[PDB]
Amino acid sequence: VINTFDGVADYLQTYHKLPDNYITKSEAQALGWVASKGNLADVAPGKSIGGDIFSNREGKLPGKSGRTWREADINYTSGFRNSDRILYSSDWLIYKTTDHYQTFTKIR
Amino acid sequence: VINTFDGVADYLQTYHKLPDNYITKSEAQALGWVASKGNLADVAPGKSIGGDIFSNREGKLPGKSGRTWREADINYTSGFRNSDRILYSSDWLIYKTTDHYQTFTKIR
Amino acid sequence: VINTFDGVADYLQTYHKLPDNYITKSEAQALGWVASKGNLADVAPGKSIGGDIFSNREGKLPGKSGRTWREADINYTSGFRNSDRILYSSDWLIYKTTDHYQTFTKIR
């Protein structure tokens, strides 16, 4: 019902209480809601996950002795992580994937 | 593949079973999926979180003896909670924040 | 700051490290982030939840001896599940709901 900055501010000034569409964290929890901790934006705004080791167990990326592969999320703003990743090797080859490691394209 | 109301209804009438893009809750779980309880819309449609105490440990909001601050989510429809909050004091001052308590603007 | 395929690839080639907006999974976790397992697209791309028994305890759907009701998600792509469901009986009657089982409309 009422959930805008000005709509809520005016209601608070007039009635001295929040509109009927609001419930406290306790009430929400009593109903079965458990706050998710999966949105990276909540704990680290403007950041993205990246720098971890990609095993390359499938072998779709070119292997070599001493070469390790790493990954980083691309196009992430907030919410759930997507399927876009950039893969880079210790010797600097760069690949991309937009389908969560199903296929790769060399981009440099 | 097939996931619309009419596409699924016609497939059910013709084949008497769901299309190959559907899996039961058990099957999804066997694969590693665990239903999230973080979407407030699932347990309380049309509602928003609001009314809880805001500590104001940082002191960006004007303090006073006997004055307590509370908050409420703004612009929430469903899914993850955003960074929009309205702050109101026991004596009725009103502020807003759009960056999850980083900065505040007096709006009344 | 830098999170596009070409922006990140060029930064990696020039500086040999990810931009300052990236943090590893460990670092994110140290900060309080716990990867959600609630996005079906992560474990089963292109799939939707469907085929489970709908109890019909409320009785808004026509009951009969030997008739069981089942449901399936509609319009799902990724992220949180929505409120769209198709209900079908053992004897093939088809209904739809767009408000998470509050109201139903016979569609076949």
Side-chain angles (χ1 to χ4, degrees), chain C residues 37-71:
Chain C
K37 274 156 70 178
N39 186 358
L40 184 63
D42 281 337
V43 298
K47 307 274 179 46
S48 292
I49 295 294
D52 289 292
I53 289 294
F54 177 67
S55 296
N56 192 35
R57 300 279 272 125
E58 294 90 334
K60 312 192 186 188
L61 290 181
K64 177 193 171 156
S65 289
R67 168 187 294 161
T68 70
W69 288 95
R70 290 183 192 274
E71 32 108 324

Side-chain angles (χ1 to χ4, degrees), chain B residues 1 3-10 12-13 16-18 20-28 31-39 41-42 78-80, chain C residues 36-40 43-44 46-52 71-77 80-86 88 92 94 96-98 100 107-108:
Chain B
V1 62
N3 76 335
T4 55
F5 278 114
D6 292 300
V8 176
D10 297 328
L12 283 170
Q13 265 181 339
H16 294 154
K17 76 183 305 223
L18 289 169
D20 295 333
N21 59 298
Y22 283 93
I23 54 176
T24 65
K25 256 168 281 182
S26 288
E27 293 179 277
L31 296 184
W33 173 78
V34 181
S36 173
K37 274 156 70 178
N39 186 358
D42 281 337
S78 66
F80 291 118
Chain C
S36 173
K37 274 156 70 178
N39 186 358
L40 184 63
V43 298
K47 307 274 179 46
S48 292
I49 295 294
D52 289 292
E71 32 108 324
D73 284 18
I74 299 294
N75 301 321
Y76 181 75
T77 268
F80 291 118
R81 291 174 65 212
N82 56 35
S83 305
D84 298 333
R85 304 281 184 281
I86 193 160
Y88 58 102
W92 307 109
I94 317 295
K96 77 180 268 190
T97 179
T98 56
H100 206 164
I107 56 174
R108 283 301 178 276

Side-chain angles (χ1 to χ4, degrees), chain C residues 86-106:
Chain C
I86 193 160
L87 290 291
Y88 58 102
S89 68
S90 43
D91 52 336
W92 307 109
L93 297 191
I94 317 295
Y95 286 70
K96 77 180 268 190
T97 179
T98 56
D99 56 20
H100 206 164
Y101 314 117
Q102 292 301 141
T103 58
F104 304 88
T105 300
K106 187 170 182 288

